Design a binder for this molecule. Structure first.
Ligand code: FMN
Lengths: 163, 845, 130
């Protein structure tokens, strides 16, 4: 499969979904941050902090504009990078859900071997695996394989690439 | 004689030099700790797993303290004392634990809960080692206050800051158990006694108020909807504020009275005013609990009687689904409304109050700012007002950048607050008499002589010590009935504000910061460890830090950017500004103008007068044509004079010969001092090329919108040493012009621009003298709009210089220019329709 | 404000500049020119001891180095070390004094009479043949 850099659109979708504790389906893309949160402002400041750490600069009043406009504004200065904290979010995902012997290097080289997805797709499949957090000890290595197999299928169905 | 003792967690390690006389006992814990310690992993990103050597020594301190008994002298006291002392010496460089915690967050890959664990361990260790905080700290802030270089004011927030306040109390019981455990246990026992004394109290507490059971075991905690109900939330928000006060008093070693004395004044927002008076009573650690009792007793009787005056009722599902579908919150008795003036909101409430009967009428309850209001009333009546508002607002994803400012549809927000009772409204009035009858039964008075510091009234902003009658009757009256004029009540002069209230960064402090930006007031959020990336307001670490970072002044724009006079050896007086200091000429520039400044004879004549002027790239079509113009400017200016170039960004044909020609000419050392890119702002990578490769002194950028101003900020942040000239004009300019007001975008962006000291902020459009410009030099221009003064670094004069002797404009065109009467700023937008003051707007190619 | 035709560009700009000076003088210096702080030359200030001896190392900060050599008083040596550009006729080339005193292991800069501008003498010394 051809190496493609991670899209800014699916990154914003994953960060906002993963922070609000919902599925990636339940967050529509044509939606504002004030729309999704509502009256609650505690999570507003840490969401705006998660946009300001991931890309660096943000447009003015980013909470009152759809995530479509944020995706097209951020993609212009965004090139394949995983930011800073989203590498600590997948580090927390595999040290708490993935079992022993499931280091990123082992899951990365395996889904490069079997599936054939390069580093630009590996990022995308790890972000899809984070968005629908299993919230369960995946002790069985093989059940955790079926997990990343179902998350490589979800990434393939979203982006629109045959496998 | 000391033996090394290594304790480790994978890669990260620490070696204690423990005396051999206590090595056998200290070696014991090293394996038990390493048994308790989980399996070392990559990155240490798992929970309950130390990330840095500091956290590890922390986890050890925590584990050792868990075995030490305070009452009985144990064998482990000796091993605790030297591992604590080692941690202090090797990490706390004379500083506080909160400064360490804050350092481990922004450098290391440590998450918030790990630092919260570290703090708890260190503090528990310190109290278990029988080493209470009795030595007064050397915190930079309280040193400064002693000297008289900083005045503190303690503000206490109230309701509506968070739907999840109770977890803020849980964090205090977890992290600072030892400091506030006794306070919390006292308040819980006080509240339980007040339930058994008041006749119908038990009716209101359906799931009880056993707050010790809810803190020890999270699962037995009731749902957020119960916790939000005022009879719980009112006293408990009181406790959280007092717990944050106590933690601050204890970790600085002060008594409450000493800490209260160090404050110039103290006020609070809504029920926060009860806690602000409660501390102004206090003195010694032994006489604290009598002030606390009064405070908790007031908030309990407000909570109970204000619930029995207006209990929340089930809301029709039709209103709920309409609200959620149309992207509002769950309706509540208090509606927040941003970005509308109070007169505007008062119109929209008069519309709604005209139809409704007396006992269903909304009213403005809080003025939290110029344009930040909270309406209180029945949740339906506010959903009524919310429909009226939705009808009269623009869609949030609308592009009005192409519509003249004056005709734009005003865009605002309106959300329901996470509160459960309409505070500061006619609906709670029946409770007033009942509350006061109950405070006199429980012998809960505040007396004016006992209040050591001034306590500012939320209505009129006056001190409560000068009040005639009962102060408690005025506190009740200011919470349940009278509105809160927050900008009136925070008129006090202070360099620092301590926000103890709940909500942390979503609390009263950050709102007060917004309201005071550029007046040289630093808000410190006293109840939250965190890191502000902007660093515009402080966090809990600032209070306890002993280095300079503790005492951080927020800029006062009037003083920071004061225009000054300065003379050179010769005698020539200059106006000194950020801009004139750089270029060593008056802060007045004639901008690039096609065709006024395409002439080399005018660019020479304005350079020779000693003023900066851009040669206009708009009037040249090749490098040879511009090279020949420039050569004519250099042949006409004096030795060591300079000038600039204006290249149009929307003309990519001009840029592809323009930029290489500048690069070439600067390599030959032609006196091109700067480049202005007009008609659009470059991208970061193109700007980064222009800044690095052209060998320029500065770069002019003429943003049109707020989006463009953000792109200038971003360019300046990526090259923090290179000077950027942000030449701001409104739509009232000559030539190609935007739709934008000259004032409104600067009012919004001034603060952000000023965060970047390499931006020289130049003002243009509508200037022709020293009288119209002066209010922008001195910054008084922004006082008309109720903002603090916003001084500018320089001015540009396009239209004004078009009838000068040296301009190539034809004599009949000069007479035609001079015959235009013009118009003032408020009329200019008429140019879109008809000839306004001799001038009209037309579309280009 | 565009009323008076064929006013010389000096007369317009000076009028605005002087207008500001006259208004600031009255408001902030009590209409007294003698309260205006003087310098030698006004310009080239980015918006961001008599007898001394400096010793350049490998790790010496270029900007700190030049600031130290320059001194605090605005005078000829302040320009010499902090001007980024000097003039050859009408051209603007890189300040050769900053290139020459660019800090490197071995270099020793002895300043004598660094209080009086008239008499100041910045001496650079290097290992020459050991
Ligand atoms: C005749 C004329 C020509 C102009 N030509 C240009 C130009 O080529 N590029 C540019 O960025 N701005 C141009 N401007 C805008 C000026 O740079 C400046 O923003 C404007 O003149 C300020 O408004 P004011 O004219 O009311 O003083 C022009 C303005 C005028 C009046």
């Amino acid at each position: 499969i051809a190496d493609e850099p991670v899209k800014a659109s699916l990154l914003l979708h994953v960060l906002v979904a993963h922070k609000l504790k919902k599925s990636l389906d339940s967050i529509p893309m044509s939606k504002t941050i004030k729309d999704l949160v509502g009256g609650k402002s505690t999570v507003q400041n840490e969401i705006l902090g998660d946009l300001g750490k991931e890309f660096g600069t943000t447009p003015e009043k980013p909470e009152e504009t759809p995530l479509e406009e944020l995706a097209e504004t951020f993609q212009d200065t965004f090139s394949g990078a995983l930011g800073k904290q989203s590498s600590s979010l997948l580090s927390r995902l595999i040290s708490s859900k993935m079992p022993g012997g499931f280091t990123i290097t082992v899951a990365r080289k395996y889904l490069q071997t079997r599936w054939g997805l390069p580093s630009g797709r590996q990022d995308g499949v790890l972000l899809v695996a984070l968005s629908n957090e299993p919230a369960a000890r995946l002790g069985s290595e093989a059940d955790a394989k079926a997990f990343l197999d179902s998350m490589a299928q979800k990434y393939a169905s979203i982006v629109g690439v045959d496998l | 004689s000391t033996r090394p003792l290594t304790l480790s967690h994978g890669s990260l390690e620490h070696v204690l030099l423990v005396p051999t006389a206590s090595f056998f006992i200290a070696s014991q814990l090293q394996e038990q700790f390493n048994k308790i310690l989980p399996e070392p992993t990559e990155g240490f990103a798992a929970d309950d797993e130390p990330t840095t050597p500091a956290e590890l020594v922390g986890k050890f301190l925590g584990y050792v303290s868990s075995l030490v008994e305070p009452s009985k002298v144990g064998q482990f006291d000796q091993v605790l004392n030297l591992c604590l002392t080692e941690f202090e010496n090797c990490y706390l460089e004379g500083n506080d634990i909160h400064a360490l915690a804050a350092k481990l967050l922004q450098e290391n890959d440590t998450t918030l809960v790990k630092t919260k664990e570290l703090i708890k361990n260190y503090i528990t260790a310190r109290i278990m080692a029988k080493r209470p905080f009795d030595k007064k700290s050397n915190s930079a802030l309280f040193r400064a206050v002693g000297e008289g270089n900083a005045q503190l004011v303690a503000i206490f927030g109230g309701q509506g800051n968070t739907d999840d306040y109770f977890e803020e109390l849980r964090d205090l019981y977890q992290t600072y158990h030892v400091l506030v455990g006794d306070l919390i246990k006292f308040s819980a026992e006080t509240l339980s006694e007040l339930i058994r004394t008041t006749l119908d109290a038990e009716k209101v507490f359906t799931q009880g108020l056993n707050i010790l059971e809810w803190l020890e075991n999270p699962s037995n905690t009731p749902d957020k909807d119960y916790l939000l109900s005022i009879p719980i939330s009112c006293p408990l928000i009181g406790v959280i504020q007092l717990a944050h006060y106590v933690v601050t008093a204890k970790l600085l070693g002060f008594t409450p009275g000493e800490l209260r004395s160090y404050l110039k004044g103290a006020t609070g927002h809504s029920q926060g005013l009860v806690t602000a008076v409660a501390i102004a009573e206090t003195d010694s650690w032994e006489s604290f609990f009598v002030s606390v009792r009064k405070a908790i007793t007031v908030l309990f009787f407000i909570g109970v009687r204000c619930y029995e005056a207006y209990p929340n009722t089930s809301l029709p599902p039709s209103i709920l689904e309409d609200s959620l579908e149309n992207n509002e919150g769950v309706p509540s008795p208090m509606l927040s409304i941003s970005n509308l003036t109070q007169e505007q909101v008062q119109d929209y409430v008069n519309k709604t109050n005209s139809h409704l009967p007396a006992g269903k009428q909304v009213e403005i309850s809080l003025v939290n700012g110029a344009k930040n209001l909270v309406v209180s009333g029945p949740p339906q009546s506010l959903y009524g007002l919310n429909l009226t508002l939705r009808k009269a607002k623009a869609p949030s994803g609308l592009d009005q950048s192409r519509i003249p400012f004056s005709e734009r549809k005003l865009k605002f927000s309106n959300r329901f607050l996470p509160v459960a009772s309409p505070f500061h409204s006619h609906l709670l009035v029946p409770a007033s008499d009942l509350i006061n009858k109950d405070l006199v039964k429980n012998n809960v008075s505040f007396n004016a002589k006992d209040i050591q510091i001034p306590v500012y009234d939320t209505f009129d902003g006056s001190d409560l010590r000068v009040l005639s009658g009962s102060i408690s009757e005025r506190i009740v009256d200011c919470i349940i009935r009278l509105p809160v004029k927050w900008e009136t009540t925070t008129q006090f002069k202070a360099t620092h504000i301590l926000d103890f209230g709940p909500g942390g960064a979503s609390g009263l402090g950050v709102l007060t910061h917004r309201n005071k930006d550029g007046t040289g007031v630093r808000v410190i959020v006293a109840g939250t460890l965190d890191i502000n990336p902007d660093d515009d307001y402080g966090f809990k670490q600032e209070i306890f830090d002993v280095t300079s970072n503790g005492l951080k002044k927020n800029p006062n724009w009037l003083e920071e950017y004061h225009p000054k006079l300065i003379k050179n050896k010769s005698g020539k007086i200059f106006v000194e500004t950020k801009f004139s200091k750089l270029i060593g000429r008056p802060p007045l520039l004639v901008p690039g103008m096609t065709p006024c400044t395409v002439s080399p004879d005018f660019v020479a004549a304005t350079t020779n007068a000693g003023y900066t002027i851009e040669l206009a790239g708009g009037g040249y079509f090749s490098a040879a044509g511009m090279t020949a113009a420039i050569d004519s400017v250099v042949s006409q200016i004096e030795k060591g004079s300079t000038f600039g170039i204006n290249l149009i960004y929307v003309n990519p044909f001009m840029l592809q010969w323009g930029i290489p020609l500048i690069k070439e000419l600067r390599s030959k050392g032609y006196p091109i001092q700067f480049l202005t890119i007009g008609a659009g702002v470059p991208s970061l990578e193109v700007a980064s090329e222009y800044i690095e490769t052209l060998g320029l002194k500065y770069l002019g950028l003429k943003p049109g919108s707020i989006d463009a101003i953000s792109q200038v900020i971003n360019i300046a942040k990526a090259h923090p040493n290179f000077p950027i000239a942000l030449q701001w004009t409104g739509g009232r300019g000559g030539g190609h012009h935007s739709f934008e007001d000259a004032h409104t975008p600067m009012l919004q962006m001034y603060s952000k621009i000023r965060r970047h000291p390499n931006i020289m902020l130049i003002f243009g459009s509508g200037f022709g003298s020293a009288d119209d410009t002066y209010p922008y030099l001195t910054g008084e221009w922004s006082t008309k709009f109720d903002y603090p003064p916003m001084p500018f670094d320089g001015f540009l004069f396009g239209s004004r210089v078009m009838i000068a002797k040296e301009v190539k404009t034809s004599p009949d065109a000069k007479k035609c220019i001079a015959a235009c009467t013009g118009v003032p700023d408020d009329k200019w937008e008429q140019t879109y329709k008809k000839p306004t003051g001799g001038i009209v707007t037309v579309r280009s190619e | 404000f565009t009323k008076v035709i064929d006013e010389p560009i000096k007369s317009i700009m000076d009028g605005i500049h002087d207008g500001h000076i006259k208004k600031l003088l009255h408001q902030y210096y009590g209409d007294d020119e003698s309260k205006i702080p003087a310098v030698e030359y006004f310009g080239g200030e980015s918006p961001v001891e008599d007898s001394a001896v400096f010793k350049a190392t490998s790790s010496t900060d270029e900007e700190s180095w030049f600031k130290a050599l320059a001194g605090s008083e605005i005078n000829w040596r302040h320009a010499s070390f902090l001007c980024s550009f000097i003039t050859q006729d009408k051209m603007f080339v890189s300040n050769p004094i900053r290139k020459v005193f660019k800090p490197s292991q071995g270099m020793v800069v002895e300043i004598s009479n660094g209080n009086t501008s008239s008499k100041t003498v910045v001496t650079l010394s290097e290992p020459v043949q050991g």
